[PDB]
Design a binder for this molecule. Structure first.
Ligand code: CO
Ligand code: CO
Ligand code: CO
Ligand code: CO
Ligand code: CO
Ligand code: CO
Ligand code: CO
Ligand code: CO
Ligand code: CO
Ligand code: CO
Ligand code: CO
Ligand code: CO
Ligand code: NA
Ligand code: NA
Ligand code: NA
Ligand code: NA
Lengths: 221, 221, 221, 221
DNA sequence: CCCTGTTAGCACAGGCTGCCCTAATTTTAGTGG
DNA sequence: CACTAAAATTAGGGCAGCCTGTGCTAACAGGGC
């Protein structure tokens, strides 16, 4: 059928994910993350620009238009409501719902959404801690590991694991094994290479590269 | 993204659907049902034949190969397990689950399938009475209105409403309103034009064309 | 490329030719003259009716609409101006120009038409005697052998040989050999089978079937 | 009927035209010139290759087969004999004959060709200077502006204006106004962008892009 | 029968858009010699 | 200022999926002689 299921939507959500991670939305990013060639992401963006879903600014960063953002949210909303349903009701293992939802997010009707809201008791986040956007236009409804000073370790409590980390399954798995998940006290220390090392009381240590770090939100506590 | 989500799968399932209805699997049929041009379905079938999913026989009827059938079933299975999940758990309205499932059927993993089996207590049919196929290769596990003699009406109990009828949403709705659903005593009489008229005690009458009739199974009772 | 070069135009021009011959414009006719199956001419007529070029009446005879006739004339005009150019200037043999122009009639620009008018000195007929139509909307500008009483022969002077006769090349050739051409005194007598026999002083006799006869205009003289 | 009148022939002639201009015959070229999509030209070339009219070489350039070239010439021959007839006899204005012939080239019989030879006194070129090919198979019968060294202007005499230039009507018009036509002394100098500037004694200057330049043959004199 | 159409299924030529790829180049911004 | 890593562009294609125009055959339907 199609790897991504829906190219445009996956481009939009990748744009969004990058913003959520606090990194500059460049075309080069999309290529890395969706594993497509440079020429491809460029030609694809065009079609998208030509359809008023986004604009390539002066510095070349991607800017979502009024329309483009509305949709991007829409997809992200379904995505997370799905991960909820998969973990809570369906009972699918944690380190597997993201990849499943990354597909469902492109077919869930807006109706099934609403009904899922009522069946999960007006949830507000995903099994990974990220908030469910666009909940009201549907009809209802803290730092980043990179923003942590180096030097001496720090005690914090894991609050969010944005989609990007959810991507590397090998890692999202290790993190579960070492308990690094929402509402989990743990200490982190800035590595030499802009990275971050997580010290979990009881389990082996786990180090995240600068990029992966941009995708973990914690609370200084 | 794509109307059908996945063309090939929908062509396979339509082949299957026709068999289930007991009508000969011609390319002309697929074109009607998927609303595509003759040339389109032809060219698409070829690609399919070229990948050994089906063969066009001498009389030109479509025959699913060993491989093709296995996949066709896999789809039909996800389809029905989903309609189950949509009606029972999610709580989505009856005359709406089919259209929703027609899309989910192309993205549900085999894993989510199995778990849905346990969550629904090893169901064996869909909210419309059709059996869930390939349940064992997964890892677990009466007449047709056309075959009804003409003349005087006959009391029967609606047992199945195959996917074809679920298709015409306007009709599947009327049928719900008139109560014509699984385990429902009603009488049927053969119309002049090979059609069939259903007399529901209490609600307006409802007449089905010969084609739609091929898609309703009942039990002489 | 295409036998007819342009299906639609040839259908229009055949309708026109039929009128010119005084026979009823039925779809059956077009099928015979363009050598195409019944189903083909029908479906093609629909496309034409759907584009308002003609209408199928109550008796089923074909009626050219305002638009359809304007175009029809336009083609006939090019066809005849071309036959002129082919015989007078190019110098292509008589019994061959018709077939050539039947193709040129579908590519001659309206401009080349006007200039051909000046190069041939405002002609008004074809090498076969038929009048060049629509000459003013461009920008410038007697009985039928069937309508002849039977019994005793009649002296007449050949005035026109409509396209239909130009069609049968074997016949249009014999007619040339027997001198039966425009401005030629000859006698004709009605045969038993609604046909007609032409008596040419000097050459063998030549008999035309009722149909071919509908395509020859003469002057009682 | 059809924009090109005859796809295959136009493709063949475009291959020829490209060779005549000294540029590599790529599918991408055809697409540009006949204004059709990439996929279209590709699929069409296949039908052509499948019928042994051409072959796509290793470097992907198009090679006309024995048969393919014969036909190609045939079309080019008609095309030019026609431009001759249009200008000399019909009297159609210069910057208009090419477009007309581009259509007549697909319907002129081999007989009408021969006869046009005799009517134009065995011509050997077109009103633009290009030689009339395949004249013997019928039955009868210097540098390129890009190959000109840069630096100081050069006096040359325009000898040919290949079809490609005849295409851009706006340009072929200007060239007439500035007298740049066969047997015309004029000077040309290489522009920075691989282009070429023609200096006509008396009329405004005229600059041709690198591509157009590939389409003009002259004689160093 | 003969003369006219209709109904149902397909074929092949011609055209198109959305997505994706590789081989080169080019364009951006910094970076030390 | 040459040099570069990083990010894009330029060039020429590939395959999946959709369309309309034109043509044909087998079979069947109706009216009138
Ligand atoms: Co996720
Ligand atoms: Co996705
Ligand atoms: Co950073
Ligand atoms: Co269903
Ligand atoms: Co489906
Ligand atoms: Co039946
Ligand atoms: Co004629
Ligand atoms: Co014609
Ligand atoms: Co008559
Ligand atoms: Co020309
Ligand atoms: Co042409
Ligand atoms: Co060049
Ligand atoms: Na890829
Ligand atoms: Na369609
Ligand atoms: Na035919
Ligand atoms: Na085009």
């Amino acid at each position: 059928m199609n790897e991504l299921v829906d190219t445009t939507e996956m481009y939009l959500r990748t744009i969004y994910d990058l913003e959520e991670e606090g990194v500059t939305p460049l075309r080069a990013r999309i290529a890395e993350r969706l594993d497509q060639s440079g020429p491809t992401v460029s030609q694809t963006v065009s079609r998208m620009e030509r359809d008023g879903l986004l604009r390539v600014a002066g510095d070349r960063h991607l800017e979502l238009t009024e329309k483009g953002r509305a949709l991007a949210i829409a997809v992200m909303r379904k995505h997370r409501l799905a991960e909820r349903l998969l973990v809570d009701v369906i009972g699918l293992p944690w380190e597997e719902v993201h990849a499943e939802a990354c597909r469902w997010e492109h077919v869930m009707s807006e109706d099934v959404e609403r009904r899922l809201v009522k069946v999960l008791n007006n949830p507000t986040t995903s099994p990974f801690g990220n908030p469910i956007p666009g909940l009201d236009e549907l009809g209802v409804g803290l730092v980043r590991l990179t923003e942590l000073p180096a030097g001496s370790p720090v005690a914090v409590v894991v609050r969010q694991l944005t989609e990007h980390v959810q991507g590397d399954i090998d890692l999202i798995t290790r993190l579960k094994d070492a308990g690094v998940v929402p509402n989990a006290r743990v200490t982190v220390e800035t590595t030499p290479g802009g990275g971050v090392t997580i010290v979990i009381p009881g389990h082996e240590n786990v180090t995240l590269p600068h990029e992966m770090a941009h995708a973990v939100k914690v609370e200084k506590v």
